[PDB]
């Protein structure tokens, strides 16, 4: 596991090309996330 840039706690990946894509994020310390909800699902075949 790498380190965050000096002076930062995370990275925000911001798509500049696709307008419709939301952001992605990266943390470099396991204790900066808590897994609150576990979601069980299927993807659905389009009509």
């Amino acid at each position: 596991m790498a380190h965050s840039p000096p002076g930062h706690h995370s990275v925000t990946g911001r798509p500049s090309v696709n307008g419709l894509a939301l952001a992605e994020y990266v943390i470099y310390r396991g204790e900066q996330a808590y897994p609150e909800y576990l979601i069980t699902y299927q993807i659905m075949r389009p009509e």
């Binding site: 596991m1 790498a2 965050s4 840039p5 002076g7 930062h8 706690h9 995370s10 990275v11 925000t12 990946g13 911001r14 798509p15 500049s16 090309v17 696709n18 419709l20 894509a21 939301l22 952001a23 992605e24 994020y25 990266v26 943390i27 470099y28 310390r29 396991g30 204790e31 900066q32 996330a33 808590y34 897994p35 609150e36 909800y37 576990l38 979601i39 069980t40 699902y41 299927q42 993807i43 659905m44 075949r45 389009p46």
Partner: protein, 161 residues
């Protein structure tokens, strides 16, 4: 230490989470190769994850970050998809769950798009798909995602394609 509490589909907490999941599906540039082709999900179950020791570990580190960033943890709820979900709910995130070849370096990655996290449920690039049918687009097998509380503090902004 972990217990799972089932939410009723009639609870508003269930509904608020389901809606976050459904409304953040988008199209992917791979045309569905990694995650499959779908516009929505069948939600089978939502469980709250309760672990005292993991929570205090999170809240302790959240205070440290807040204090280094004008009392602002910059806390989000974000999706995480991974073959390691069972280890994560029992033992917490660590360097073993890192995306070593990720575009923003070797760390633990989270998405605003549920569909983006879905691309990793079977591994990087979707791996070989579901264990039973070897199908990245399986409509039968049960998948699991996490909706996590993530402390971003001061986040480095990387524009990108």
């Amino acid at each position: 230490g972990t217990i799972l509490i089932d939410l009723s589909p009639d609870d508003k907490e269930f509904q608020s989470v389901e809606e976050e999941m459904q409304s953040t599906v988008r199209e992917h540039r791979d045309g569905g190769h990694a995650g499959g082709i779908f516009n929505r999900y069948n939600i089978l179950k939502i469980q709250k994850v309760c672990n005292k020791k993991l929570w205090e570990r999170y809240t302790h580190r959240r205070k440290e970050v807040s204090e280094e960033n004008h009392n602002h943890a910059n806390e989000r709820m974000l999706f995480h998809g991974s073959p390691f979900v069972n280890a994560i709910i029992h033992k917490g995130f660590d360097e073993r769950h890192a995306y070593i070849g990720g575009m923003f370096g070797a760390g633990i990655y989270f998405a605003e798009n549920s569909s983006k996290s879905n691309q990793y449920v079977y591994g990087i690039g979707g791996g070989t798909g579901c264990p039973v049918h070897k199908d990245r687009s399986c409509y039968i097998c049960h998948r699991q995602l996490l909706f996590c509380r993530v402390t971003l503090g001061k986040s480095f902004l990387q524009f990108s394609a």
